[PDB]
Design a protein around this nucleic acid. Structure first.
Length: 158
DNA sequence: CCGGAGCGTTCAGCGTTCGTTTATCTCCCCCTGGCACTGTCATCTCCGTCAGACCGTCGCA
């Protein structure tokens, strides 16, 4: 399932590359740890392969992902509750869910809201974080350059 | 030898321009009200005064 040198998407950190497989022993049990890293925060993540699906790791989605996130990005008739508190409570939950379709919907609706009137400066931090993690997810999926990854999305979100 | 013209000063007709106000239209400040998974007891003080008194307080006798 998991090999060396491959790219894996980790929640709240985006795409990452695996360095090696670690065989550290805990209580006399040889767990199959794997170590991975990103270029954003300069951190190393060690996850055993047995509970990898439980913690929420996920591989690189092929050609079946960009088309579905584009068609849910272009999906009209999206509505939000009138009170901003319910939508505010929903969006970070959708971000923490880690689904690509959910984060694409959140960034599309939020970008539309910022375009129409302009929300605030506080929400700019989370829009920026979501755009960063989404462009990092799509950058290593299509194997494109990061500047090309952020450039290609500029003509499709309108 | 006054008479007229030109000149100096001073006022009444209407004709425009100021001095000081007024309500309406943007931009901002400031106060009260809403948020709905649950989330139901903190906090470190204080020591090597100090010197003895003044005083009430308090349990034992």
């Amino acid at each position: 399932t998991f090999k060396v040198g491959d790219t894996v998407v980790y929640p709240h950190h985006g795409a990452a590359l695996i360095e090696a497989i670690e065989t550290r022993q805990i209580k006399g049990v040889d767990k199959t740890y794997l170590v991975l890293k990103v270029a954003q925060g300069d951190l190393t993540v060690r996850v055993p392969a047995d509970n990898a699906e439980f913690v929420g790791v996920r591989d690189v989605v092929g050609q079946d992902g960009l088309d579905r996130v584009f068609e849910v990005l272009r999906a009209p008739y999206a509505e939000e509750p009138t009170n901003w508190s319910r939508r505010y409570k929903a969006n970070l939950e959708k971000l923490a869910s880690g689904d690509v379709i959910k984060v694409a919907e959140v960034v599309r609706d939020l970008w539309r809201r910022e375009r129409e009137r302009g929300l605030s400066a506080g929400e700019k931090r989370m829009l920026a974080k979501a755009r960063q993690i989404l462009v990092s997810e799509l950058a290593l999926a299509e194997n494109t350059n990061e500047d090309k990854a952020e450039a290609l999305l500029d003509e499709v979100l309108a």
